[PDB]
Amino acid sequence: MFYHISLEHEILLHPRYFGPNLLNTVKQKLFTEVEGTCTGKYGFVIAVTTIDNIGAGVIQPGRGFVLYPVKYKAIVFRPFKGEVVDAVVTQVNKVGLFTEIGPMSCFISRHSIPSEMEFDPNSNPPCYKTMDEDIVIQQDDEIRLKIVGTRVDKNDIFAIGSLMDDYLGLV
Amino acid sequence: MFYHISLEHEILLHPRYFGPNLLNTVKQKLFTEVEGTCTGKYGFVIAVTTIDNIGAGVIQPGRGFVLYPVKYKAIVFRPFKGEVVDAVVTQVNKVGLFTEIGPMSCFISRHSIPSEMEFDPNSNPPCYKTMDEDIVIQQDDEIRLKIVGTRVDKNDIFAIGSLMDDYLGLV
Amino acid sequence: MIYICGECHTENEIKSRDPIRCRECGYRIMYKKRTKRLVVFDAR
Amino acid sequence: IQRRLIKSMESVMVKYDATVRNSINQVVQLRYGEDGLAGESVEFQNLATLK
Amino acid sequence: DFSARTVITPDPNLSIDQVGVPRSIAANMTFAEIVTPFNIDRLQELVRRGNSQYPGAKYIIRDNGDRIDLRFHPKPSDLHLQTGYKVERHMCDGDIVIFNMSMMGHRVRILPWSTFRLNLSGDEMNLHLPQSLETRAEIQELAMVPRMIIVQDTLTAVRKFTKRDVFLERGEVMNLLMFLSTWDGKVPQPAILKPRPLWTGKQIFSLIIPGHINCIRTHSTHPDDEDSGPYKHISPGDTKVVVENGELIMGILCKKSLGTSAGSLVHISY
Amino acid sequence: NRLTFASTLSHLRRLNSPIGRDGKLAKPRQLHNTLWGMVCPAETPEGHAVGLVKNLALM
Amino acid sequence: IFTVLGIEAVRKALERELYHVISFDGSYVNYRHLALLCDTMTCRGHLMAITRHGVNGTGCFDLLLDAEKCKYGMEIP
Amino acid sequence: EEDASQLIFPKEFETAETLLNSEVHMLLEHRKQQNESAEDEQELSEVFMKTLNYTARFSRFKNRETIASVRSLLLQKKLHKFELACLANLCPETAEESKALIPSLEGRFEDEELQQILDDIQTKRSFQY
Amino acid sequence: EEDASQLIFPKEFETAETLLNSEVHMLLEHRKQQNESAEDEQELSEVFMKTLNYTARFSRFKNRETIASVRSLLLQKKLHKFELACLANLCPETAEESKALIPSLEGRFEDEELQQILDDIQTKRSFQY
Amino acid sequence: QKRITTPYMTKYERARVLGTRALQIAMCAPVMVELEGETDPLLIAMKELKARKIPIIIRRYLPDGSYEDWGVDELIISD
Amino acid sequence: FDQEEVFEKPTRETCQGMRHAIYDKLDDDGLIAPGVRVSGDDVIIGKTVTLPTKRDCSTFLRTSETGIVDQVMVTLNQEGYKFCKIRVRSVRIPQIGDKFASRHG
Amino acid sequence: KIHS
Ligand SMILES: [Zn+2]
């Protein structure tokens, strides 16, 4: 889910960037450190809107690197547990549907999929279709799923979804 | 340091030991599980004096292993931080004196040793002796040291000592 | 392996990593004649 | 409806004190069915002391 | 151990609790069993069979928890097992399976063909096998079909069978009584001894009724005025069902009398 | 659908009910009188999408 | 009925409405099952909508081993 | 220990205001425009591109006026901020769908009033053709 | 977060009563005797052997009577249980040595009274020859 | 003593007691009753319940937190 | 540019990663000729990727049905790369599990 | 179905 937050990030600036208008270098540096990354607590930081303020630069003893606490406004994508949200299917395998909820990728297990659905390796391309053929989930298909749980791995958030709940599927 | 404690240990008993007087098997089993081991919280369990009581055996569902909570009286060796205690030297190296405080082994760093002391590789056997030769620490020498800190590793407690404090040495 | 053109139905030998085209036609679809290893058929 | 009803009564059970309680241990009914009898063994009959 | 779903077909011969399963599906499914001296030889032979033969074991688990695949069979010594081991022997006859939150357990019977067999009394299903013995014992004690509780092809024939018109010759009676599991072994005395023996349908059905259960029911085509008339006990149309000492003395059975309801032969017997 | 020749013919003449506000407000699933001679009444897929998909009449 | 007669009266009214629809087609359901549903909804003193989540255990007793009863017994082997 | 259905989550996100998928696309577009031309910097991260496609594909509104109208319309009610974006992003067809997908709404919204809100969103969301 | 000098340690050890190095040897000997002969079991763990040598080497008392006398003598005073074994195990020569080695004693013990206690321990500890 | 639970044994208790005992029997557990060739472990435990020899003691947890120790032999089973 | 797909027999030596299956069915060109019976898990077309030694990525039978390849087609796709299609023919005998339906009902 |  998308939110508007005010976060704090300590920026490490090399003394080489102590030239005129060094604040510009700090401002542009913040567009690379917290931009495009995925903090495990607040989720993916997709973009940064503006900068609130830049704190005083404290020089760390011994290290010689000035620390600049800067406050900025950014939008994060934090998947809350037990939240239903639309997703896009990127691939389908016997294990289960592989979905894509925005920047992150959510995996759907076969057990979580309703029993009526049955994987078909013959059909080109693969798509979980039930016997009645009423509902079929192809690749790049907009489907709604509920995230039972989320786990953080290697500075990334991996989500697990399910469709056992009512009104989860193509609609 | 040696203490007298009453600990709790859940004993896992196989159904094969459900024969007559099975309580004896539980009693003898406790003399192998908590005996000779080294818990990281209470230190080395050098010996067990007696058994207080044996609780009711609860059968774990599915597993089929009956769990017997048993209370026993035992003596532990827990090295408290910042505690001065006698030690026995087991080996001497350029890095520093290697001591032995009962069941565990405590290592003394060269820096912690007083500056007056100087390692002598020529002397057979090695022994940290100062220039004045007044005090010499040979192997198997009873010396007093203060444990600055202790760390738990692989179910064992490793202690670090020092002799900078007054009245630490051969006396 | 030996293939068959889908237009003239003539044998044309095509090797590995070779363009698929019939010399007599230029036709771009080729078929395989048959395998010399026969199978067992039971009337059931 | 079937799924909804089960979820709202999944934790409802009869305890050893002949009382109906949920996971939170709240008393739903003092006695199961207000009588404390199973619904399978009961048989239909008409007592003839009122008609 | 979820199995591959397959279509369902009926099988009157199988008991309602029993379920038919093909060899191929049972081969994939495995049931871990703890080996004991009383059945040490049974596991010794099954493991020797191998995975190529249907009565085999997919894996064998030692006391330390190591699993050895039986497909390769590298050493004969590894094949040998000790007491207390766990062997994932393939499903065989007599095992308990559970399928469609209330689920009914069933006893698996191996049949040659592929489709599942169920004694209904179509849609694909997947049968689940309880690996643990504790839950297997619990399932067979409370989740079985008898504790959970007739086809339309039998009720229609039952009404015709119990009709007073139906008369069974000695030859016909023999075949019917052969299929009767709850038979004392003694042929009942014919209702019409002369000029030739002729057992009525009710007499054969009387042995079908278990024990001594008494109940009174009415046929669907039972005139209301018949009960008030003098012929209430002797029904002109045999529309009144009465059972005494487990014997169907009179009346044509139907869904009202034999089918599940507030009062019925099946309900009273239960 | 090339499973059967009849299926192929039906698919080519297949019709779809309107979607969105127009379809939502109306009752495309229900069979109307105007279908007489224009859209086959009997032919309709079975399921939730019953009556939404139809087939053109022969003539 | 809740705002006029109270939650207690709703329990009977809810039973009647539930039984009325169930008995309309001739089907019958045991009163104990029907009463349980009404009691759960009104257990908190106010009408509660049935859990809309609709996503969908023998632990009230524990088996304990006794050494006294194990004094007798011979191993099968 | 957090669950969206029960409206439990870290206290930090309480101060944050939710954003719509279509609205975020505008913010991403503003970020994309300046980076592409305003300053000579490295190409945007793959994460930024991935979310841009997701927002564009699921964008339920054409222009800011439609987005603002829905935001203003839902702000008048007691809708929680978490439900503000979730309802608009999901676009439930009817009131029954929204409550099942959003358990929170059932707590303080009736079957009739909410239906009058979802249908309003339908009149705002624009279809391709 | 625990320090012996400041008398801070896990609350569990408070109930425990300290033991002397020589006294522990007796307990180990009792454990050793039964295992060796009373029951046929596996040989004692290497940890048990290692501590047995440590206690025997640093055993400051010959028999139980000497151990009991020192324990009773120190029990009459307000000596903390942690200091009870530590003082006896260390056997400080003079009062000044004990306080520096044991910071706790300096809090509630004077330079004169404690000296009268350490010298008593000296009269009890037995030398080889 | 002072036990207020029903003297009879519930079906759930019977199923679990036999199941747990049967699992124990399969793990080389001793059998109190005489063995007359019954190989299947469930049969061994079934007759043990009939003879009132199963060592298992049922601890019924009351909803208030109290527990009552009811022996299988003490409980009245239905045969 | 570095890695490309090719059609050839995935020999056990030249190929590092492979799946346990019978490879005698494939011909010198990596394509099974018409008339060969195929049953269970069997490779019917040989494809390998020259990862930066090659890794096997052949295609096996979708199911375990026993069938005989009917015809084999080798072509060039729109991109110009070699492209082939093969039709596996199997005979199904009606059995107890097959579903039969009348013209109505 | 079964072959799958
Ligand atoms: Zn040609």
Numbering used by the authors:
A (entry chain S), B (entry chain G): 1 to 171
C (entry chain L): 15 to 58
D (entry chain A): 860 to 910
E (entry chain A): 360 to 459, 467 to 487, 498 to 525, 537 to 657
F (entry chain B): 471 to 529
G (entry chain A): 1365 to 1420, 1467 to 1487
H (entry chain P), I (entry chain D): 14 to 142
J (entry chain F): 49 to 127
What do the study authors state?
Eukaryotic gene transcription is carried out by three RNA polymerases: Pol I, Pol II and Pol III. The Pol II dimer is incompatible with nucleic acid binding as required for transcription and may represent an inactive storage form of the polymerase.
The dimer is formed through a handshake-like interaction between the stalk of one Pol II copy and the active centre cleft of the other copy. In our dataset, we could also classify two more distinct states of the Pol II dimer that display a rotation of one Pol II copy with respect to another, leading to slightly different locations of the C2 axis. There was no cryo-EM density for the clamp domains in any of our reconstructions and no significant protein degradation was observed for either RPB1 or RPB2 by SDS-PAGE, indicating that the clamp is mobile.
